[PDB]
Design a protein around this nucleic acid. Structure first.
Lengths: 139, 52, 108, 126, 149, 150
RNA sequence: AGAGACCGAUAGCGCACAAGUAGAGUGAUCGAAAGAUGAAAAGCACUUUGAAAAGAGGGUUAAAUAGCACGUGAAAUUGUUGAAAGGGAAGCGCUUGUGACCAGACUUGCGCCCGGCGGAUCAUCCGGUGUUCUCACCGGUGCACUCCGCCGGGCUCAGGCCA
RNA sequence: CCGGGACCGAGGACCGCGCUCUGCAAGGAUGCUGGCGUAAUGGUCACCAGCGACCCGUCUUGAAACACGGACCAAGGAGUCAAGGUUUUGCGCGAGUGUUUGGGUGUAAAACCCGCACGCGUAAUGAAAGUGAACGUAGGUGAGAGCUUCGGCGCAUCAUCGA
RNA sequence: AGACUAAUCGAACCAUCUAGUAGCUGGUUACCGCCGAAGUUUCCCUCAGGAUAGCAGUGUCGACCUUCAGUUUUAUGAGGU
RNA sequence: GUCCCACCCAUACCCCGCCCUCAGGGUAGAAACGAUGCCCUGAGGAGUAGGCGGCCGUGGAGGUCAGUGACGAAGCCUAGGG
């Protein structure tokens, strides 16, 4: 046909609404973007098969593109909530990222993103108090 | 005031651009890439009954 | 646009006779060669004639209706009889039409 | 957290390139301007004069735009911006924009402490 | 430098100061070296001079690139059709001036030597016979090659 | 300092198209892959001609294609990295198989009516990835008003 | 009468103001400068020192760090206070030193072996649902040598600056 | 062959060349140890010290010198617009191409639609009257990328002889 | 006396044409990167003269195919000195 | 005056690091990439007139960031820092 993921990448490689460009790097706000980097590898909204992970109240929520529902945005996302042990979450995410050939190149990124979200959901450790240094600050 | 304010465009190129924009309007990823909130839209292109 | 100009980069570094009352409508006579003569026939009928589905008819082409006054003789014609009505004709064009089996009719 | 392991940061030059005669005229800013006079001693590079910037001073590609801790500054305006650094807490540090109010700053600092993202100006508006 | 000595140095591939090349002695090359005597010092190198030159500062011209001669595979790939498959073959060809001396010497990149340890003579830009450093010094080139290599 | 009487020369040919056509970019990527992973010189020539500008890619007409189809070339696939135009002086179009960047509407209609086939360059890459049994054609480069007034 | 990819008080008409005014020229003519307290004058009662202007208290205000010199309040230039230098110029570049003042970094993390707690989103099987059609989620089952957090130790590893 | 000293440690799973082959000094630094864990290292500012260092712009000629401008600060301040060519780049259509003088229509200076004429191009040459482009697979010869059934066919283009 | 005609006279003052013209004088506004110059060569009537060769930068394109070269050697000239 | 020995230091020469430019390579039955990217190897670096490329900045317009803001926007000062 006239439309492909390669076409969409050439159309939106230089500008899209998800693009966040700064001096130290280019980031993306796309929900189907693992690692939030602007590239063809991680452009989930561009690629036909794509994975995204968002936090839940406890655990992660993983969405994957359905290839047979590309023109139906209400039913284009296959959504699973993992609220269980981190190891089972990693196993299931790696299985749906690698076992059936559905973006096996995104496997490490997906597992790492799930690990980062589960790490952030832990309670934080209170910081040591700041030490006053020198003469004008100390006195 | 006699600066050249208006631009003459070929009608064929105007129609070509309109066709390309209509074709891009049926591509659901480009709708999201242009900032539109279409996650709850049942189908693209969205066709509603003329009786409504 | 001003932003693309080189000035923005350079910011900081600076016979014969005379014809009185000529009327071109006198000398209006556009010419067409014979290799474009079949293009004046409508496309479907031209395809029928060139394939050979019309062996008992001949096309009559009025050049003045298409805007041409002289039939010139560049190219070659297929062996199909064509009646051509023109104000002017060259000798080679008339000869090639006669070899193709048609006639050149003179009109005003 | 601690930044990713990197090669030692080398600054080839720490002093700034002061504009010629800006120390003597107050209408001249110290921002660098290339002297274009044909008899100019700085432009002709006589010794004992001010240096001129060139690409030979350029920094290592591995450590360019790195703050001394080893992070790269990323400007953030709100919590949805600081959540963009979820996967980059060892390479990018958040820097809150100057026009963000104190309540939103507290929200950003809380979210970044959850995410393990270093904030360069976390003591602001306290 | 006048255009004729400049052209001769360009053809001898002596484009920078302290560049050295190996030259096979014919009349056709001897006259060129005689012309560029105001800029060069030359002589007759021995086996020692050849072997530390090739071992320490040996670079080959491999597809127009200056590659250090650190493995015999490079020598075999670039000079194996002439029977030179090793660095000792290259040393032998250069020292004995074999039938493929042109190929071996041109494969060798021009040697980029350092300044001599101990310096030159006090008046450097005179002929060797007058107490200077220029011209033919014959077997005395070896001490200069030791100092500059 | 080193005496370099000669000077190293930067390349004087295009390495990429100036065009912003995304489909042309896709063709450029495909033929970069083909010219890198195959030994056929045809793919390199096609990639070079894809880089070119419009005055370097003059149109090729059906009469020119019909002329070059003679003398044992009737079964070869015609390849033109340019626009293929119609010639109404050519009354009988022979059966042919042409791959081109684009066709005019009359040229495509006349080829299909004569019974041949029209391909794009990506279809050409699919069917003949090494350019076998192909006739590569160019249009008249010097047939231009600027070249006449040079 | 409606508009602008126009200008924003040294701009835009000369004129955003008692502007073709004030002023100049015998005259014909020439022809400016000049907007902004505050939401609201609430534009400072009263006491005290001064001949007064004003000052000081004390008040109004959200603010007088807005006092009819009035929004913000830059530079040149000036005063006071603090530091320093100076035997017929200073200023500048490279590199130390002294004094003064500062940005980071660090504060511990991960993984094992034990002990004590608190829970059963342990494995398998069954049914439903979705999917990438073999992978998951949900409800039952687990009965604590299985999983998940916490708390004490012990051990290994990695950890900042100068040597 | 054996000492003594200085400066440097780029790369980051394995792959290779090798050797003295349980391994290695063989395609780039590791191991051990101590003090400190902060203004100690480091940085900025002021000043002293050693060394270095003419006042910028302009003009002139070959060059200097002469000459000219510069008390200081803020704001303003100089290759622009239109028409017409020409070369190059991108784009649409292509022997055609150009809707926008005009008409239709409109959510009304927008957008959309329409077509007769006309412009340029499709034929040149001559002062003009006028005449007007195939002997041949649109020719022969030498090159020529590419393709080939490996005999050849031969794009663009160039040179040459013909029509 | 070229004197005076409102401090204005070898041609008053005022407004306009008018932003008159200058080849002459002055000035002409961020940074980094890649290249990078030149002075009778040849012709024209000169100074109050012109073109022009040569030297450069960006694009391209062609098989970037042929190879060429401010050099030596060989043969042979000039210089037999 | 000649001869001899050692020594001093240029942005010159040698070795190493880094920056940029240029050149030559590798990279899809994609576990796949700001391919306008990344990896490997080599050489080079003065510059007036002049030519070209890339970036920074200012006033305004369309789109976008469900952008910042009286819990303080723009502006201004700053021997305070990146």
């Amino acid at each position: 046909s006239n439309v492909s993921a390669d076409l969409i990448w050439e159309v939106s490689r230089n500008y899209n609404s998800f693009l966040v460009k700064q001096r130290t790097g280019t980031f993306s706000r796309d929900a189907l973007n693992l690692t939030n980097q602007h590239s063809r590898k991680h452009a989930g909204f561009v690629n036909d098969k794509a994975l995204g992970i968002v936090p839940a109240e406890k655990g992660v929520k993983v969405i994957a593109k359905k290839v047979k529902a590309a023109n139906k945005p209400a039913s284009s996302l296959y959504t699973v909530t993992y609220k269980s042990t981190a190891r089972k979450a990693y196993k299931a995410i790696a299985s749906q990222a690698a076992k059936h050939g559905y973006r096996a190149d995104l496997r490490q990124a997906a597992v790492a993103r799930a690990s980062a979200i589960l790490r952030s959901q832990r309670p934080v450790k209170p910081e040591p108090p700041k030490k006053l240094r020198g003469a004008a600050a100390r006195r | 005031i006699w600066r050249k304010w208006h631009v003459k465009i070929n009608q064929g190129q105007k129609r070509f651009a309109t066709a390309s924009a209509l074709a891009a309007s049926a591509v659901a990823p480009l709708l999201m890439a242009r900032g539109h909130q279409v996650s709850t839209v049942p189908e693209v292109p969205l066709v509603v009954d003329s009786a409504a | 646009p001003t932003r693309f100009s080189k000035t923005r980069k350079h910011r900081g570094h600076v016979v014969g006779m005379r014809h009185f009352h000529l009327l071109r409508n006198h000398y209006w006579r556009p010419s067409i060669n014979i290799d474009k003569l079949w293009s004046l026939v409508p496309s479907d009928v031209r395809e029928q004639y060139l394939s050979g589905q019309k062996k008992d008819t001949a096309p009559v082409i009025d050049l003045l209706s298409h805007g041409y006054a002289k039939l010139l003789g560049k190219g070659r014609l297929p062996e199909i009889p064509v009646v051509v009505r023109a104000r002017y004709v060259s000798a080679e064009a008339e000869r090639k039409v006669k070899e193709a089996g048609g006639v050149v009719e003179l009109v005003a | 957290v601690a930044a990713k392991k990197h090669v030692p940061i080398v600054k080839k030059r720490t002093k700034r390139f002061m504009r010629h005669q800006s120390d003597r005229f107050k209408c001249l800013d110290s921002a660098w301007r290339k002297p274009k006079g044909i008899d100019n001693r700085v432009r002709r590079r006589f010794k004992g004069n001010l240096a001129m910037p060139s690409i030979g001073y350029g920094s290592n590609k591995k450590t360019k735009h790195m703050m001394p801790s080893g992070h790269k500054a990323f400007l953030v305006h709100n919590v949805k911006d600081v959540e963009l650094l979820l996967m980059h807490n060892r390479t990018y540090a958040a820097e809150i924009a100057h026009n963000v109010s104190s309540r939103k700053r507290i929200d950003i600092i809380t979210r970044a402490k959850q995410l393990g993202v270093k904030v360069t100006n976390a003591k602001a508006k306290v | 430098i006048p255009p004729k000595p400049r052209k001769i140095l360009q053809l001898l591939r002596l484009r920078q100061i302290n560049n050295g090349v190996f030259v096979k002695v014919t009349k056709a090359t001897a006259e060129m070296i005689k012309i560029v005597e105001p800029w060069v010092a030359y002589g007759y190198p021995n086996l020692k001079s050849v072997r530390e030159l090739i071992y320490k500062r040996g670079y080959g011209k491999v597809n127009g690139q200056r590659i250090p001669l650190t493995d015999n595979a490079i020598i075999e790939e670039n000079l194996g059709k002439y029977g030179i498959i090793c660095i000792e073959d290259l040393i032998h060809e250069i020292f004995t001036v074999g039938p493929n001396f042109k190929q071996a010497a041109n494969f060798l990149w021009p040697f980029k030597l350092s300044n001599p340890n101990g310096g030159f003579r006090p008046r450097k830009f005179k002929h060797f016979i007058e107490g200077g450093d220029l011209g033919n010094r014959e077997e005395h080139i070896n001490a200069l090659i030791r100092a500059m290599n | 300092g080193i005496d370099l009487r000669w000077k190293h020369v930067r390349s004087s040919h295009r390495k990429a198209p100036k065009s912003d056509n995304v489909y042309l970019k896709l063709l450029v990527k495909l033929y970069r892959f083909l010219a890198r992973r195959t030994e056929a010189p045809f793919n390199k020539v096609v990639l070079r001609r894809l880089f070119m500008s419009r005055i370097n890619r003059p149109p090729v007409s059906l009469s020119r294609i019909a002329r070059n189809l003679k003398n044992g070339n009737e079964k070869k696939t015609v390849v033109v990295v340019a626009t293929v135009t119609d010639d109404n002086r050519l009354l009988q179009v022979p059966k042919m198989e042409v791959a081109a960047l684009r066709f005019t509407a009359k040229a495509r209609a006349r080829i299909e009516a004569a019974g041949g086939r029209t391909l794009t360059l990506d279809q050409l890459a699919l069917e003949k990835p090494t350019g076998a049994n192909t006739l590569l054609l160019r249009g008249p480069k010097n047939a231009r008003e600027a070249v006449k007034h040079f």
